[PDB]
């Protein structure tokens, strides 16, 4: 029906506009020269790379990005392994009280950071150990594991373990058959859970901020939250906007690629 198809065509662009303009705004506010800073036009003029050149001029961002990625990978891997090791027992084993073990994790996933920050800073994790990566990786892992348990449990409810029964008639030895049959089906699940943990662990500001304060471990959200101008007497907003555009630039292209996996993992395969 051409009128209702037009109405849907309108609804589709409206929701795209709602999601994109507060992003394109940052790009435009960054690209606007300091003459067009304080000029109210959203449509830019005389756009310049000078602010982006000023981000990479001096080593201030290199360590923030490189530490964000390093912490992302290590907290992903340790969460994926122990979260998968839990998820196999949560799916395949049928032990008494198993609902408690899944129930408590989805609660501590939501726990209030401004509680945890006081005791940890006043412990051997801030007085003994302090700013080096373990002082973040240990709390990061804790908020990551529940998301690993949920998403990996959803993938292990999806795999038919009766494929193992078929495999145990395709010869017998599981140390060959299970190894060769099951891993190709496990892979798209585990890589999706790894992506979602990497992103979910990326942006917990209160712990990233409160436990670091060095050129090592001052991760990408903290770097921009301490940043307040590239220069002495330039209007700082264009430089801040450039920094925000730099920091976001990886994770947009990252989620842009893996969309089916991302929505399936959160939706437990429902879409």
């Amino acid at each position: 029906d051409a009128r209702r198809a037009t109405w849907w065509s309108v609804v589709n662009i409206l929701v795209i506009v709602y999601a994109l303009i507060p992003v394109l705004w940052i790009l435009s506010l960054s690209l606007k020269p300091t003459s067009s800073v304080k000029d109210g036009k959203l449509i830019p003029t005389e756009i310049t790379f000078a602010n982006y050149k000023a981000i990479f001029s001096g080593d201030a961002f290199t360590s923030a990005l490189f530490n964000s990625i390093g912490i992302g990978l290590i907290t992903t891997i340790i969460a994926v392994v122990i979260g998968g090791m839990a998820a196999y027992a949560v799916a395949r084993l049928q032990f008494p009280g198993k609902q408690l073990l899944i129930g408590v994790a989805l609660l501590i996933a939501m726990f209030p950071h401004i509680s945890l920050v006081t005791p940890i800073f006043n412990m051997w994790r801030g007085i003994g150990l302090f700013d080096t990566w373990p002082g973040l990786i240990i709390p990061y892992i804790t908020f990551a594991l529940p998301l690993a348990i949920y998403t990996l449990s959803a993938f292990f409810r999806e795999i038919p373990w009766d494929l193992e029964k078929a495999a145990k008639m395709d010869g017998a030895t599981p140390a060959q058959a299970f190894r060769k049959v099951i891993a190709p089906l496990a892979a798209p699940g585990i890589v999706t859970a790894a992506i979602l943990v990497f992103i979910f662990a990326w942006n917990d500001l209160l712990l990233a901020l409160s436990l670091t304060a060095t050129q090592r471990a001052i991760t990408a959200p903290v770097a921009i939250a301490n940043f307040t101008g590239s220069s002495q007497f330039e209007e700082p907003t264009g430089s801040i906007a450039a920094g925000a555009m730099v920091i976001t630039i990886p994770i947009i292209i990252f989620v842009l690629i893996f969309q089916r996996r991302i929505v399936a993992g959160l939706t437990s395969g429902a879409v």
Binding site: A220, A225, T248
Partner: peptide, 24 residues
């Protein structure tokens, strides 16, 4: 196209999404 767009405000770094509103 819509599934693409609806993920962006989910994925984006919370501080960068916040400076957007601070200047707006």
């Amino acid at each position: 196209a819509v599934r693409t767009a609806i993920l962006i405000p989910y994925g984006i770094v919370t501080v960068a999404a916040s400076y957007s509103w601070y200047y707006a």
